[PDB]
Write a structure and sequence with these properties.
Strand order of the largest sheet of chain H: 1-4-5-6
Chains: A mainly alpha (about 110), B alpha+beta (about 210), C mainly alpha (about 70), D mainly alpha (about 60), E alpha+beta (about 150), F alpha+beta (about 200), G little secondary structure (about 35), H mainly alpha (about 450)
Distance between the termini of chain G: 39 Å
Largest sheet of chain G: none
Radius of gyration of chain G: 15 Å
Number of helices of chain H: 20
Order of helices and strands of chain G: H
Distance between the termini of chain H: 61 Å
Strand content of chain G: under 5%
Protein name (chain H): RAP domain-containing protein
Family (chain A): Belongs to the universal ribosomal protein uL29 family.
Strand content of chain H: under 5%
Helix content of chain H: 55-70%
Largest interface: B-H, 24 and 26 residues
Order of helices and strands of chain H: HHHHHHHHHHHHHHHHEEEEEHEHHH
Oligomer: part of a larger assembly
Helix content of chain G: 10-25%
Shape of chain G: elongated
Number of strands of chain H: 6
Protein name (chain E): Ribosomal protein RPL22
Organism (chain E): Toxoplasma gondii
Pfam families (chain H): RAP
Amino acid sequence: GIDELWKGSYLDPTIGAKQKEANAVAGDAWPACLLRMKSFEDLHKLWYICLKEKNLLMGERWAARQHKQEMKQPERLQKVRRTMRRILIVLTKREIQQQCLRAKDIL
Amino acid sequence: PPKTPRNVFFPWQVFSVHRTGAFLERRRVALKVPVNLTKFEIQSYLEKIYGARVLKVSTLIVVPRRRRDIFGPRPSMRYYRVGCTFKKAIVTLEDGVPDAVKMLRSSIELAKNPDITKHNLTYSGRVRAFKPPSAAQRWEMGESKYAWRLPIPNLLAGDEMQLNPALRIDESTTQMFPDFSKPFFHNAHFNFSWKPEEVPFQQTVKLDITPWRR
Amino acid sequence: NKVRTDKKERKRAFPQRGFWKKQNFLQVKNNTVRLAFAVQGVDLLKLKRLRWGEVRKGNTGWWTDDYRSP
Amino acid sequence: NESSPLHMGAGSANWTAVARLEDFTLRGLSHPPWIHVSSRPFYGAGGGAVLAACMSSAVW
Amino acid sequence: SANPYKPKSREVFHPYVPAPEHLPPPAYTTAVLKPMQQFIPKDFYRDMRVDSLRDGVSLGSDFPWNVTHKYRFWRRRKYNIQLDDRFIRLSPVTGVDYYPRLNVFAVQWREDGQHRIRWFRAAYGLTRAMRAAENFRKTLEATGRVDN
Amino acid sequence: GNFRIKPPGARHAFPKLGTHRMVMFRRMNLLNWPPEDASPLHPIEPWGRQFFVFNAFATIDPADWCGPRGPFPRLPPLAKPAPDAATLAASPSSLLSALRETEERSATRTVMCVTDFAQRPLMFLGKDDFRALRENLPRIKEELKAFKERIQPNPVHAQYDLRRKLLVYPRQAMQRLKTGEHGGYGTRRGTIRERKT
Amino acid sequence: IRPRKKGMRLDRRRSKKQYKHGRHVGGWNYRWLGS
Amino acid sequence: GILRPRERLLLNALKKEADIRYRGRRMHKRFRSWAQQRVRHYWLPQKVCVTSDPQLMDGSYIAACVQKAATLRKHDLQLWHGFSKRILELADSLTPQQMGYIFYGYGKSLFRHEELYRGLLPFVAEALPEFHSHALMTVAWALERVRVNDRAVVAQIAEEALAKKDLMRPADFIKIVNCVARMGAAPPSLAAALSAELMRVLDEKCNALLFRGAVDHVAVATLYSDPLRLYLLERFTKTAICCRPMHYQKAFQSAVAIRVLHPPVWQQLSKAVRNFYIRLSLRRIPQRARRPSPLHWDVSNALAKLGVFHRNTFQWGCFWIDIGEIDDRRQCWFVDGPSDFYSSTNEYTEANKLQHRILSELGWNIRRVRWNDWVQLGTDMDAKVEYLRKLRERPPWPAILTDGPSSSRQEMVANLRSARDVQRALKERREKNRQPHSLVMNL
RNA sequence: AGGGCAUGCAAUACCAAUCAGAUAACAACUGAA
RNA sequence: UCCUAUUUCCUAGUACCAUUAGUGAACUCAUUUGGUCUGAUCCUAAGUACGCAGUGAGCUAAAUAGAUACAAGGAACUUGACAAGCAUUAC
RNA sequence: UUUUUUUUUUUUUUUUUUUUUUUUUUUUU
RNA sequence: UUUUUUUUUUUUUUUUUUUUUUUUUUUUUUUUUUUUU
RNA sequence: UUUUUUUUUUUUUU
């Protein structure tokens, strides 16, 4: 629900500093390599997951901005942006295939 | 920004919580949204993605003020702004929300405590506050002044609540009952706009515009 | 003006003896804030007056220490 | 000398200036001048795949 | 100025408020007020109270207070208080006047078909100046220097 | 207390205009003056003077008293010490709770108090005092009536009247309005004009 | 410009006058791209 | 230019008056709004002609026509009866979609014609498997409005709804439930299953807007179990803001009935919840304008002639009373009618029985007067007075209301027809007495 | 140039008497560019 | 059965934009304490059953700008009656 | 409570703005 | 007399205009064609 | 200076 907006983030008042630091950790962005092997449904779900993570991150970003301080672990945003771009790249190529085919038949 | 199409499969809208320095109600949350979204669209976003219960959505336009580069050893005298134009959204959720998320806190400035001060302050240059009539105050769907003594409510209110208004009168801010015969104010105890029958007859005085005619 | 664009710097050039003090209004405003915190039950004046490293629980001060010889 | 934003905008605005028999060759901060400004420079040692140059002639 | 272009009377006006000449009878008229059969339609009192104040004559015993719903005026209401019915700056003697800017009393009287006005400074005292002006007018009338 | 600690709603439940404005400011200072366990105040008509019966805290015996200290000497109360830090650390209560610990007083001294319009203490009376005062009421009314006869009028009025009767009283001018080009003559005359048919 | 005066004037972009000069930041001799 | 002083004054005063007048108009206008909403996701694309030849019409055509007529409020007997006649002929070639439309139209129009309902029911019963949410909802909704109970078919409808729960709409599901509860055709097992599905539906696919529609006093106390009762009651409190007087009334009624009938469940509620309802009663709830019926007036005249004081119309907390005695307030009368009973029968409705029992519990000496019994008396006043007097000396009705004897369409028709002329002759006689007719002109 | 590339600069002129505007039924109705 | 006819009608959650609700010329201008004072209205007021507002220190020089009180004479002053004065005094 | 929209009344266009994106086979559920 | 307002829209009257049209929201009530008054 | 279901259209008027 609404709680998701701040749950597990630094903004969460029901957890300690160690839990927030443990939660803060993240991995690598999804590459085109992996993103190419997935189907339409998996990419569609991953898009919404990345959007939720971006929405959570933005809050912290703004919070930090308020106090004139740098956000902890700023690379997350970058990671999410790269994954979001790669998904659409994949899809667009998939489409271009068909477009080409069509063109060919008309000619 | 780009217009939203009919069928949205890969939405780009980014939703976030905004920490406001003013006081907010229990069932009210402040969000930061683009300047190109509607009430309905906002409602649906939260209803479908988050699946949160929503009642009302209010929108406001936020524009940063102008600033000038005057300070420093080498000022430029150039104009600028801080932040960006956005839509301040206010969502009236069904459930309650903690204040520690929506409202700011600071110990250095003890005066900055919107959560503690509640609506007692204006947080702006408002010398006089404004408060329209309440639902309960209004005629339609309003609390009755004589319904307390009814038989039906008492049935419900069985050893659970006292409907008698005489048991909830502040003693530190109330005066003793005066005598009708004797002069007295109307506002002392008469919480209405009609003269009680108990009050004796009152005389009327008409101003004399041309007393010299006498 | 906050932007500092009007001709409001002209008068300031000349010397002056004194200026008004809106004590009456300021007092009222302060009182209202004090009241708004008092209804909740927190002392603002006390905290705005206590010595840096001073601890005073409740309504206490110098006077408290008088009778509290032991 | 009164202040009238309506008058100002109805007589001295972007759409009102174009109707003026003036020397438009002069540069204007808050106007639509007709002076050419030479665009983006030549290319050094960057990636050749990411050098932008045209848009209205290429839109598809 | 007392120019022709003014009402002849100085009484409060209560003009008739006629209803539109195409509406049907009100809803409150359908009420059976008989002791045996009783029928109180919806908003009967609401409609009738308003309707009663149409004629303009039947303003009721308490007219100034039967329509002022605002608490602003009610807050100031008092009972069993004696009040005067004459402005302090209004002498009963004809020809006396007071000026706000000049802050002084004046006496108007006609002599030999010519208008003449005298000054009376009220700085020393309002009552003293008022009585002096009244005495001057009375002396004029007694000595017989006012046309008639 | 004259105020409800942590009251409901988002706004004050009492008037904040007129005299009430002053009264709120006056009462906010002292949030604990009126004992929680106190009888309702009873003001008198002529002069604002209220009466109320309450229970006061005990005190240490004078025997065990050190002595007067400061410009306002006062006897110490009778109270027990608060839990120590070692026990509070093991106590399951929170830091907030632990820090907020206070002593414990004994309220077993019933007394009657008289205050002003402002609820300012003035005097304290006990049961024995109150009972004793009742037996001398008839003896005081006669003394008050007898003493009422010794008062005499103020000779100020008579002295002022005699002064003004047998002394000079100069009076100065007022409102000396000037004039422009044309001067005044005590009275003015209007103009006469004819109609245009 | 007043309403009466403005109601009897055309736009500058309605004419060829805008393609009869070479004024630019470089100078007075402008050469169009791809010329 | 310039104006005359005389005219100037008048024009300025007139102008001022205008301002005053305008200020004086928007007083009561509180609930208005410049913005409004119109439903448009139901009209058909194809064009039809209501005034066309019914013979050339088909199922599709007729279906469209029926709904368009209803929407345009073109109430024409001559027009509607032709539709019914053609529908009867084309009954064997109607799609589930078309049938639903037909039903909706009829219901919206309130076209009281049992002959068509009775003929179209059996075909619906056979096509139930191919039915959809919309059709299923419209059938019941129409039926309810027209007050034609069918426990044989209504039950089947419900069962098909339960079978297609995974495909149904929350709104339609809710309305089905409501309809079922009002008609009184759900055995315990069906009721239980309905309740169980309803709770999940409400808690999974319902919002503030959609939840309000689930509130029904008749349904709550006769269909809904305790677990759903408690959840409903608790969620109402939270969802109260986004409500209307129509839902408020229902809520209050629900509360009252629950308190009166089910003390246990009432006590099971929380303090906070209880407080809500407690405070609710104290508020003034708007109500629609009401007036006595012709039957009511006739009964009142007979009663008054008998020599008993009473009232016409008045509210008592949450329930309306037809007649209330002044000498003994405890006493009360109720004037029934054709609508009070199901079509072609004399069986009381669930709402009438619930309101009767609630007042009987609360101690109200309740009496009932039927219309079919009354009509028989004709235009005689002594017979009515004696009729009333014989009733008065008798004890009141029991707590539990019972149904009347059997009836038929034929009888119903006959009665109606008979009454038609009585209501006109009495009006004529009443109206004639008011005319003095004294003045005589010479001419 | 693999992919993407909101909005504004008033645009039927890759054509066609002139005269306002999304470029005007005849006539009234006029002209140094 | 003596009503002018005994003709059902609370209120559909609601697009986009404006707003600091009180005193105060808050507008051009500028030697700009925004808010007190300087003028008519808005409150049946013993000035509204405590409202708004109020800025270093010291000191008998003379001159100048003003206020109050001047013996007798009362235009002898001045180009000119400019200016000043009268219009309050037993209560 | 205003603004928006009809009339007064005007492409007497208030650049980056609108009930204004190609103008109804809309899959009525 | 120095000789003064009316169109959008509302009400009334007169009618063969039209889903470019009022919830598939809700209440009340004796009730309506042709072969039941 | 148009007030609550949207358009077209005719006469009078407080």
